[PDB]
Amino acid sequence: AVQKVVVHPLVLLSVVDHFNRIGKVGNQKRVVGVLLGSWQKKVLDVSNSFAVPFDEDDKDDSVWFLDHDYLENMYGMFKKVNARERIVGWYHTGPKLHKNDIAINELMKRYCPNSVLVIIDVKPKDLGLPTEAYISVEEVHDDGTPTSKTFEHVTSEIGAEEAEEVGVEHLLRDIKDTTVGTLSQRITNQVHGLKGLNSKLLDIRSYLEKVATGKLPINHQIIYQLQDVFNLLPDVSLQEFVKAFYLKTNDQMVVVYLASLIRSVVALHNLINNKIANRDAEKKEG
Amino acid sequence: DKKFHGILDQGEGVLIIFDEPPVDKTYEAALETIQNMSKVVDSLYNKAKKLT
Amino acid sequence: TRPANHRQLTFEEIAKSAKITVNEVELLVMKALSVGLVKGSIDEVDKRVHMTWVQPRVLDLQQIKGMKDRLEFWCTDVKSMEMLVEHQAHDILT
Amino acid sequence: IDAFRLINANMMVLGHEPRQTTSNLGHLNKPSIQALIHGLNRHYYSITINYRKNELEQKMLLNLHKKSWMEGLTLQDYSEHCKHNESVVKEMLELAKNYNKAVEEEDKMTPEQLAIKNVGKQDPKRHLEEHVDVLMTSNIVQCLAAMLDTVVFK
Amino acid sequence: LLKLFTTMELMRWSTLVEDYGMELRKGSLESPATDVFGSTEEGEKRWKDLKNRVVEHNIRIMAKYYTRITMKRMAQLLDLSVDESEAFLSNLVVNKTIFAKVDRLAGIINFQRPKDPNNLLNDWSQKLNSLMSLVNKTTHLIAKEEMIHNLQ
């Protein structure tokens, strides 16, 4: 297992230029390229990327193209200019992953033994964290699937490096931002938090209204794995939990009551120090 | 002599054992800062009294 | 059956619905805990058998009908209580 | 960042730019003394640089420092949170010990001489504003996030 | 012999002797068990140690699956006196391999631990963080996958 990947901010931008290359067609043309990273640890790194030609139809999603010859030569150039770097996987720009997206992985597992994808989003209509990545395993089921083969969710985050923090945050000056503001980000974080809570509930009832009535496969997936979600649901206001808020919140109230009691005295120093300096500079001037 | 965390009962003939809480430290350091804040207002009290 | 409200069931309803005697319900429930289809606990000063975790089972149409009713009653309360944060602080958080 | 554009030496007397606007004359700086010592305005001329931005990358260059709702709904841990409050208040007592001495002291010294005997180890009134800010923003968010996890959940 | 391994398969030493009374003396190999039980001074140490290990076996799963237990039920589920029950819980708590609290003016003892609002509020947030938000993230992605298999 890999259990997270680390994505530098040079990519997430070296994808979007290639979406901007062929983006004159407008309607739909998925970008697929080649991902470059480090055979690091259990934890893995992502550094560079480049593109590859790819087209695919609308019906019969089995007609698709990865130029191997283009993949051999251009990676042979990047191996030539950079010996530290080697391949780790691939990416595509599609907002939701398609049905075609498993045979692309089944091609290039002969390049890296654990070839990992990264889905990005050129248009995150979700205001939350984009650019999530998957990995394929086999999970052969009680039903009798010969090979239950579906990707697994892997957590991810945006990497950082000393040179690229210079160039990125120089370009952040085109908009205003409060990273220095204490508790102004924090109040937004529960706003950005609970917006994520409401977004996942409006999606799950749309799945749940369809599978209730008329049309969907009712299968022994989520419908009881989501039943376990209801099983936790802590019973918050009950017998002894009341003695957890009235023995611990009032601890943190005293520290705030201490902090106000000094902050008022500190601001009272600035009165007398100004009122002495006010009239005594006046009474010697006159 | 604090060799033991217990309590006795004459009307029961019963020894009862309890544990020790390490809690009482925030409130202890709280009131001593109030003793220091008592003097800095006194230091401002004659400062306004000596000159307005 | 009971929706986790007073799921600390006492021995009598186990001993009735399984129609085994009183002095064998503990050896009965420790078997199900040992196999692992349940993760509760056993008191004896009240002989109440608390329940925590049930394995998930198969359900049907009308169980989904109540479950959307649980979900809608939970979804529209989160959104209302999230408005009450932003309504409290409009131009305070920028 | 910097960009330059070579000029001839054969046109050293004749004008090289027609100068029909102000945008490349007095803007973005006057040329720096360590760069005109070799260059400006001999043998070449400088040139201006801006930043064009497509909307698509502009929208995602904005939001890459935020997290999921997991980070917005944590409750850090109440053992270390009380331990951190036990820590900070304890030296804040000692800052108040030093604060009583210096504010009472005030040798009539025309306070720029107060402002030269304070560089050294002297620090009242500076940590006293600081630790109050830390004890405020920690305790408020730790309470307020614990408020929502009962109102929202069940 | 696997019956002693996990969760007691609820056992009894008297039922053990009725199943093992001939592995001491009869058999085809027979040689370790006579070294275990047949020799007198080595057996009498290993008789009582087998008594020691089966009563050590039951107290462990009692601490697993009991909020409380009365004094009378422990004595009849170990099949020994209430005095010998007190000796077995004493030398295992000075060993502190099983923590217990033999409240004996009532006989009702407990196997739980006194909790803290530093601990109780921690366990409330622990279920709240790990298994209310992370599993919520999980169910949405498989619900995304069911669009792909089914439409179109």
Side-chain angles (χ1 to χ4, degrees):
Chain A
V2 61
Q3 82 182 356
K4 66 180 181 293
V5 298
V6 174
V7 173
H8 291 92
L10 186 141
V11 302
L12 188 151
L13 205 151
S14 177
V15 176
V16 180
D17 59 352
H18 189 266
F19 185 78
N20 203 5
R21 300 296 180 90
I22 51 95
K24 62 182 180 179
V25 67
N27 291 318
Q28 184 63 45
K29 186 175 183 292
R30 287 187 290 115
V31 163
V32 172
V34 179
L35 189 70
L36 292 172
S38 176
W39 182 263
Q40 182 66 42
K41 186 66 177 176
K42 189 174 183 179
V43 65
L44 187 144
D45 197 3
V46 169
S47 298
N48 198 0
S49 295
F50 64 97
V52 63
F54 180 80
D55 274 330
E56 191 266 327
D57 293 330
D58 56 353
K59 65 180 74 173
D60 188 75
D61 51 359
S62 298
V63 181
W64 58 270
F65 296 96
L66 291 176
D67 189 352
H68 298 90
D69 196 3
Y70 183 78
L71 192 145
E72 293 295 327
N73 292 119
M74 189 176 177
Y75 174 69
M77 294 179 183
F78 289 162
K79 183 69 176 177
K80 184 176 181 180
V81 71
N82 193 356
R84 180 66 65 194
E85 184 67 34
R86 64 183 187 266
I87 41 93
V88 72
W90 62 280
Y91 64 92
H92 72 277
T93 191
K96 306 302 185 72
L97 71 98
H98 293 85
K99 188 177 179 181
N100 197 6
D101 294 332
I102 190 166
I104 291 98
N105 194 6
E106 293 295 326
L107 187 143
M108 62 183 74
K109 288 177 73 68
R110 64 184 180 179
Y111 292 97
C112 188
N114 45 0
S115 299
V116 55
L117 65 86
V118 171
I119 296 172
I120 60 99
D121 194 0
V122 291
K123 297 181 290 294
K125 62 182 183 295
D126 292 331
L127 75 159
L129 190 144
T131 68
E132 191 269 333
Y134 292 108
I135 193 65
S136 177
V137 297
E138 292 85 3
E139 61 274 13
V140 173
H141 193 267
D142 198 7
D143 197 5
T145 65
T147 299
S148 180
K149 186 182 288 293
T150 308
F151 296 99
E152 293 293 327
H153 173 72
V154 177
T155 184
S156 177
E157 63 183 0
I158 300 299
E161 190 270 331
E162 293 292 327
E164 67 187 2
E165 288 176 354
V166 167
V168 167
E169 296 186 357
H170 177 73
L171 295 174
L172 265 299
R173 298 293 179 89
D174 58 353
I175 52 96
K176 80 282 291 178
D177 194 2
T178 65
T179 60
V180 296
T182 183
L183 64 80
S184 297
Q185 293 297 109
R186 272 74 174 174
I187 300 300
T188 62
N189 284 320
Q190 291 96 28
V191 169
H192 293 293
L194 273 299
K195 259 56 181 296
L197 270 300
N198 198 5
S199 179
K200 297 297 183 183
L201 292 180
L202 296 176
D203 291 330
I204 196 166
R205 64 182 295 167
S206 65
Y207 179 78
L208 194 58
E209 191 272 333
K210 294 179 175 67
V211 75
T213 303
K215 182 189 286 185
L216 246 60
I218 204 165
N219 56 2
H220 296 288
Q221 196 47 256
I222 305 169
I223 69 166
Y224 64 84
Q225 191 273 125
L226 191 271
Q227 183 181 1
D228 187 75
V229 177
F230 289 100
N231 201 4
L232 272 299
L233 260 298
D235 294 331
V236 175
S237 66
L238 75 163
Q239 183 61 256
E240 71 273 14
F241 190 79
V242 176
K243 278 79 178 175
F245 281 169
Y246 290 157
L247 298 182
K248 293 295 182 183
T249 304
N250 54 1
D251 288 335
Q252 297 177 359
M253 291 295 107
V254 174
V255 182
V256 176
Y257 176 63
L258 190 147
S260 65
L261 189 144
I262 281 91
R263 183 179 181 270
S264 63
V265 174
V266 166
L268 194 146
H269 289 82
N270 293 320
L271 285 172
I272 287 95
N273 291 318
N274 197 2
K275 289 183 185 293
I276 287 173
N278 193 2
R279 63 175 183 86
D280 294 332
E282 191 271 332
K283 69 182 290 294
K284 298 298 290 183
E285 182 179 1
Chain B
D1 293 331
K2 299 295 186 291
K3 300 291 183 68
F4 183 74
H5 292 175
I7 195 71
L8 281 78
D9 292 329
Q10 295 299 110
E12 293 292 326
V14 166
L15 179 64
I16 293 167
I17 286 93
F18 59 96
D19 56 351
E20 182 67 30
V23 177
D24 51 355
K25 294 180 184 292
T26 302
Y27 291 169
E28 184 176 1
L31 57 93
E32 295 294 326
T33 62
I34 302 170
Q35 293 299 110
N36 298 120
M37 288 302 111
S38 178
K39 293 183 262 74
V40 300
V41 180
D42 195 5
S43 175
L44 293 173
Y45 182 71
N46 54 1
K47 185 177 179 180
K49 185 181 285 185
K50 180 68 173 66
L51 72 162
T52 302
Chain C
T1 302
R2 185 174 292 170
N5 290 318
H6 297 87
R7 73 275 188 194
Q8 187 178 2
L9 295 174
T10 188
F11 67 98
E12 183 180 0
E13 193 266 325
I14 289 95
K16 182 184 287 185
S17 296
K19 63 184 290 184
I20 197 65
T21 187
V22 175
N23 291 318
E24 293 294 327
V25 300
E26 293 85 3
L27 282 76
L28 193 146
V29 298
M30 288 185 288
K31 181 69 176 178
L33 290 166
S34 66
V35 174
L37 56 93
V38 66
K39 287 195 288 284
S41 68
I42 290 95
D43 194 2
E44 297 188 2
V45 69
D46 293 333
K47 290 181 262 74
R48 293 182 183 272
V49 182
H50 181 73
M51 290 290 107
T52 65
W53 183 74
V54 188
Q55 68 94 40
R57 70 177 66 250
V58 63
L59 52 88
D60 58 352
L61 187 146
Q62 66 181 357
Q63 296 295 321
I64 299 168
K65 297 296 290 183
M67 185 168 68
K68 293 187 265 75
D69 291 332
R70 292 182 185 272
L71 199 279
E72 192 272 331
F73 182 74
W74 184 49
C75 179
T76 192
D77 288 339
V78 175
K79 182 176 174 65
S80 66
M81 291 158 182
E82 179 58 25
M83 293 300 290
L84 294 174
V85 177
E86 296 175 353
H87 191 196
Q88 186 61 257
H90 292 285
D91 55 353
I92 291 95
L93 81 161
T94 298
Chain D
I1 197 62
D2 198 357
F4 294 120
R5 289 289 302 276
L6 192 68
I7 203 65
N8 291 320
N10 299 115
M11 293 176 69
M12 63 180 289
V13 177
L14 187 61
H16 59 90
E17 288 180 352
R19 191 171 298 117
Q20 72 273 18
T21 187
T22 64
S23 66
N24 59 343
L25 268 301
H27 293 287
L28 275 300
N29 55 359
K30 81 283 293 178
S32 67
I33 192 68
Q34 70 274 17
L36 61 92
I37 196 66
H38 299 94
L40 275 302
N41 207 167
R42 297 179 68 250
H43 295 89
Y44 60 88
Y45 62 95
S46 177
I47 193 170
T48 62
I49 296 97
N50 54 356
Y51 296 95
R52 65 178 180 89
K53 276 82 67 181
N54 297 115
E55 193 272 331
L56 191 67
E57 57 89 18
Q58 179 62 256
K59 185 168 70 71
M60 69 181 71
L61 190 145
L62 191 146
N63 50 1
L64 77 162
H65 297 283
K66 83 284 193 189
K67 275 76 63 180
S68 296
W69 62 91
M70 290 70 165
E71 191 271 332
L73 274 304
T74 51
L75 296 175
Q76 183 179 1
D77 189 75
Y78 293 94
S79 66
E80 287 85 3
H81 187 273
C82 183
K83 182 63 69 177
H84 186 271
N85 291 320
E86 180 65 32
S87 298
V88 172
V89 174
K90 188 179 264 78
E91 73 260 6
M92 188 267 172
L93 190 150
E94 184 66 30
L95 267 298
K97 298 295 289 184
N98 206 168
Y99 189 77
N100 192 9
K101 182 66 175 66
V103 177
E104 190 272 333
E105 192 268 339
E106 199 265 326
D107 279 335
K108 279 78 178 173
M109 204 180 173
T110 307
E112 70 270 12
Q113 295 299 108
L114 188 283
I116 194 55
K117 71 177 182 65
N118 56 5
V119 53
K121 301 297 293 296
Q122 291 81 16
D123 51 356
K125 181 69 174 67
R126 298 179 65 250
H127 296 285
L128 274 304
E129 58 88 20
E130 191 272 333
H131 295 286
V132 171
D133 196 4
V134 178
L135 291 173
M136 188 63 69
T137 65
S138 178
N139 290 317
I140 294 300
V141 176
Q142 184 61 255
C143 289
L144 192 276
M147 300 303 292
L148 296 174
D149 290 331
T150 70
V151 182
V152 171
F153 291 158
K154 181 63 72 176
Chain E
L1 190 145
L2 189 146
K3 182 175 69 67
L4 191 142
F5 291 173
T6 174
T7 66
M8 182 177 164
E9 296 293 326
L10 302 173
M11 68 184 288
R12 182 62 67 190
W13 182 68
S14 71
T15 63
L16 183 143
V17 174
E18 292 176 353
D19 293 331
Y20 289 158
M22 293 181 287
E23 72 181 5
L24 276 69
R25 182 65 178 172
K26 298 296 291 183
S28 180
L29 56 94
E30 194 268 334
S31 59
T34 304
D35 185 75
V36 172
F37 291 112
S39 296
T40 63
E41 71 276 14
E42 184 65 33
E44 183 65 31
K45 292 177 71 68
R46 291 179 177 178
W47 286 110
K48 300 293 180 67
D49 199 6
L50 186 66
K51 291 294 291 185
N52 194 3
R53 295 294 179 271
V54 297
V55 69
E56 186 179 359
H57 195 282
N58 307 133
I59 301 299
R60 289 181 290 164
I61 72 158
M62 286 178 184
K64 294 179 179 67
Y65 297 111
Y66 288 103
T67 294
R68 292 180 181 91
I69 182 166
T70 62
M71 187 64 205
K72 300 295 186 290
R73 188 170 174 86
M74 180 178 287
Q76 67 183 357
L77 268 67
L78 295 174
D79 286 336
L80 51 95
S81 177
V82 296
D83 195 4
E84 190 67 29
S85 296
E86 293 292 329
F88 284 157
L89 272 73
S90 298
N91 55 3
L92 292 175
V93 76
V94 303
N95 197 5
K96 63 179 70 66
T97 180
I98 293 96
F99 65 98
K101 185 180 288 184
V102 282
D103 192 0
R104 73 182 71 186
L105 60 86
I108 293 96
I109 75 169
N110 55 359
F111 288 154
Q112 287 179 350
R113 186 177 297 276
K115 76 278 192 183
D116 197 358
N118 206 164
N119 195 5
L120 183 63
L121 186 63
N122 194 3
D123 294 330
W124 179 68
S125 66
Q126 185 62 43
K127 301 294 187 290
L128 190 144
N129 195 2
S130 66
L131 198 57
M132 285 297 298
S133 180
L134 296 174
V135 67
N136 194 6
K137 182 69 175 177
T138 301
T139 59
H140 185 272
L141 270 71
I142 293 99
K144 183 178 72 175
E145 193 271 334
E146 294 294 327
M147 274 65 254
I148 303 163
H149 182 75
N150 294 320
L151 68 157
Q152 291 84 18

